[PDB]
Design a protein around this ligand. Structure first.
Ligand SMILES: O=S(=O)(O)C[C@H]1CNC[C@@H](O)[C@@H]1O
Ligand SMILES: [K+]
Length: 660
């Protein structure tokens, strides 16, 4: 950065780009004090602040100290240090800070973690607090209304399992706030962005470069990159079943249709806790002999067939399981204000929270559960779930306020998984996937999944939200994203259709990982093995995925070398084309393919903007289309709107896909 004096105050810039501007009349910082309410109900948060003070820091003295007015005691010190602005609270009573960053009227801003509704965040406000993302997520839909009424569970456009206080600006810089406190990105004003933080962050860090790609590279180096995808993934789809021993018979039927399979993922490897409300799992992280009486043998048999086995784990322990008394005896649970084990309500059962701030507890979970019970048992991967349910009234062994540990949790959890994996020498071979995140998850977690979508084509909780989650999380340095094929949440009569499964499968073939899921109510929802048309369509798309493996491998190698995500926004490679900047329902699958998933029912065609000044080749027909215009193509089931660059080095490969 470059600091510079002006008539009335100062500016801070990154090269050509003014970032902060301060004068008494147009101050950069405001400081104050609030009393928040943050009530948790089954991982949903009802958050409302009561602001008692918000006071402009109008007087700057030059390292810069800031006070409310001349002759008042300084409240904030700002120190420029390389690409960082370091902040020190001089008034210990501040628990609210607002920072204005200079903005241009037509500027776009992206990132914010994994955003599910809006990719370009301009014009709206985005609180950053990990939680349940919501069912429906749109106060105008009946699903959302019903979820709010029954369980405070509808959420809204800004809720996410993985927030992050980082943005990329169309002005060619990125900004990162180093804090785990609650924060908000307010992009509602034309002339400035405003950051609200419920703390004085240690620093704000900046990244700039001459391309957006270069900035994403630099961000990915800052947060940490992922290993390349393991070879075994490229064998096909990961088939999600939760049907006990019957899972194997159903897998055989799936394989008999020609489906290419890399793995069998059985989240019920620990037992099902079937309830009147849903087919839940038994949260005790060891193989269940009642549900899978020969599981060790079955894993070995599948391995001989070239199919891996994957499970399920989360960082909580159910009160009625055998691991709970072990963890409690050792003092490894978060505690309540009286020093007893704090129990969290997950609906049909209560759990303890393994306290990862206690190094012994974190080591125990990595060694006993990830190491012995999972990896040594023969798992090649798993869903590494949750991370969002830390309540703010719980006590942690490190003595740090739960208001600050809440957002840190997903990263601590990712690190426990990564340490277990590394302890067995399996980094880059074991594949675990997380839905929750925060700053730093990038370094530990090798694969994101989009969490729970409704089983529908809705705008704010259906298929299309996955694309937004992939694009946003990709710019934040998570190179690999995928989703549950066919979505997850079935409530209030909302159930899958054949069409939904097929469209979702079409997208998933052009992402790093194809994975199915029977969902929360398996017997109420269509599954890939239960309709012959769906199953044949699925098998065909898995053959397309396998044929594409050499190209996906090259993208994984690129991700390791340069940090660029596999699924990229159009603007990353077409910077001079304004119409690419807000597009969030299409992506570049590497530089050489363009994917425009169908995300509504009953569509026989798809319209999209084709970028560039060359030619794109339609994957299924071989017909050529000129870049630089809107086009419409036929998209019958099995033929998603996918194109490849005419000049691609992988053209011989892409030509073959037409034939399969
Ligand atoms: O029903 S359970 O809560 O036990 C398991 C679910 C948890 N969230 C993610 C889903 O994919 C799981 O099926
Ligand atoms: K959701």
């Amino acid at each position: 950065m470059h600091f510079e004096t002006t008539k009335d105050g100062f500016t801070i810039a990154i090269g050509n780009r003014i970032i902060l501007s301060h004068s008494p009349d147009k101050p950069a910082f405001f400081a104050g004090f609030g009393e928040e309410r943050m009530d948790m109900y089954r991982g949903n948060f009802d958050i409302e602040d009561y602001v008692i003070e918000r006071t402009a820091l109008r007087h700057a003295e030059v390292s810069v100290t800031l006070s409310s007015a001349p002759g008042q005691a300084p409240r904030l010190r700002l120190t420029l240090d390389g690409n960082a602005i370091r902040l020190t609270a001089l008034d210990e009573t501040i628990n609210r800070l607002w920072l204005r960053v200079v903005a241009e009227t037509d500027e776009h801003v992206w990132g914010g973690g994994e955003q599910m509704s809006y990719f370009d965040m301009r014009g709206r406000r985005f609180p950053l607090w990990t939680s349940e993302p919501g069912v429906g997520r749109d106060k105008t839909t009946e699903i959302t209304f019903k979820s709010d009424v029954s369980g405070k569970a509808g959420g809204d456009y800004y809720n996410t399992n993985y927030p992050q206080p980082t943005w990329l600006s169309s002005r060619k810089y990125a900004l990162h706030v180093e804090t785990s406190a609650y924060s908000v990105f307010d992009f509602r004003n034309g002339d400035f962005h405003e950051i609200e933080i419920w703390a004085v962050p240690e620093k704000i860090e900046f990244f700039a470069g001459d391309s957006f790609a270069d900035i994403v590279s630099a961000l990915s180096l800052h947060f940490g990159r992922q290993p390349e995808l393991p070879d075994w993934v490229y064998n096909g789809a990961i088939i999600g079943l939760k049907d006990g021993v019957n899972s194997f018979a159903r897998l055989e039927k799936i394989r008999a249709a020609g489906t290419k399979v890399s793995g069998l993922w059985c989240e019920d490897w620990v037992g099902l806790r079937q309830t009147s409300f849903g087919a839940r799992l038994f949260w005790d992280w060891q193989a269940n002999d009642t549900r899978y009486p020969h599981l060790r043998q079955k894993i070995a048999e599948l391995a001989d067939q070239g199919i891996r086995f994957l499970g399920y784990v989360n960082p909580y322990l159910c009160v009625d399981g055998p691991l709970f008394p072990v963890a409690e005896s050792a003092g490894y649970f978060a505690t309540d204000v009286d020093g007893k084990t704090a129990l969290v309500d997950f609906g049909e059962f209560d759990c303890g929270v393994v306290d990862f701030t206690n190094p012994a507890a974190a080591d125990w979970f990595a060694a006993a559960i990830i190491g012995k019970n999972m990896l040594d048992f023969g798992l090649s991967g798993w869903m590494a779930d949750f991370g969002e349910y830390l309540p703010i009234d719980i006590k942690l062994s490190n003595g740090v306020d739960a208001k600050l540990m809440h957002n840190a949790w997903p990263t601590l959890w990712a690190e426990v998984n990564a340490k277990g994996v590394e302890s067995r020498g399996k980094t880059g071979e074991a594949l675990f996937f997380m839905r929750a995140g925060f700053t730093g998850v990038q370094a530990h977690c090798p694969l994101i999944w989009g969490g729970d979508q409704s089983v529908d084509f809705s705008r704010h909780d259906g298929l299309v939200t996955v694309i937004c989650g992939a694009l946003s999380s990709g710019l934040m340095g998570n190179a690999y994203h995928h989703s549950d094929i066919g979505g997850y949440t079935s409530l209030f009569g909302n159930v899958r259709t054949a069409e939904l499964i097929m469209r979702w499968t079409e997208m998933a073939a052009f992402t790093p990982v194809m994975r199915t899921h029977e969902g929360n109510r398996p017997r109420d929802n269509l599954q890939i093995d239960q309709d012959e048309t769906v199953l044949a369509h699925f098998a065909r798309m898995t053959a397309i995925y396998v044929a594409l493996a050499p190209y996906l491998k090259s993208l994984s190698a690129e991700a390791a070398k340069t940090g660029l995500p596999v699924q990229r926004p159009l603007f990353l490679h077409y910077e001079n084309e304004p119409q690419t900047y807000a597009v969030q329902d299409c992506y570049l699958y590497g530089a050489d393919m363009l994917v425009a998933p169908v995300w509504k029912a009953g569509e026989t065609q798809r319209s999209l903007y084709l970028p560039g000044h060359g030619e794109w080749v339609h994957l299924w027909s071989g017909k050529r289309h000129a870049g630089g215009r809107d086009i419409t193509v036929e998209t019958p089931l099995g033929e998603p709107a996918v194109f490849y660059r005419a000049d691609s080095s992988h053209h011989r490969l892409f030509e073959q896909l037409r034939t399969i």
